Amino acid sequence: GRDYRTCLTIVQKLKKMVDKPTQRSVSNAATRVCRTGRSRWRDVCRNFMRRYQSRVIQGLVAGETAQQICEDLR
């Protein structure tokens, strides 16, 4: 169950890190997002992105809401 929550937090973080969400801007932000925080969050974030990054990036580029991006995990 944690995956859905991790997904929502990451979507929110990435939307503030980029200006216009494109394949390049989002992907670049996605390599940085998991490096901010204490060790537990860095780990959880990293493990999530390794599994799910393609779908997160796709969703941001599509202008999906966080819930739409993360729905398969709900």
Side-chain angles (χ1 to χ4, degrees):
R2 136 233 293 150
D3 292 349
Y4 180 69
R5 298 188 289 282
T6 301
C7 187
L8 294 172
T9 296
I10 292 170
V11 168
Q12 291 310 110
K13 284 174 176 313
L14 288 172
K15 288 185 183 263
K16 300 182 171 65
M17 295 171 69
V18 301
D19 178 21
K20 192 181 185 40
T22 63
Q23 183 74 28
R24 181 169 174 259
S25 72
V26 178
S27 296
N28 280 333
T31 70
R32 301 183 296 239
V33 63
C34 302
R35 287 216 155 78
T36 288
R38 287 174 178 266
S39 185
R40 179 170 167 234
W41 170 247
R42 296 194 308 267
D43 192 73
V44 168
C45 184
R46 175 182 8 243
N47 294 343
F48 175 96
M49 292 297 275
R50 189 154 176 170
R51 290 158 180 147
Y52 300 108
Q53 60 82 212
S54 181
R55 178 64 179 86
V56 174
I57 295 164
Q58 177 191 112
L60 290 156
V61 174
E64 285 177 350
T65 68
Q67 294 88 342
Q68 288 166 342
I69 299 178
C70 301
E71 178 60 15
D72 304 347
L73 299 172
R74 187 173 56 75

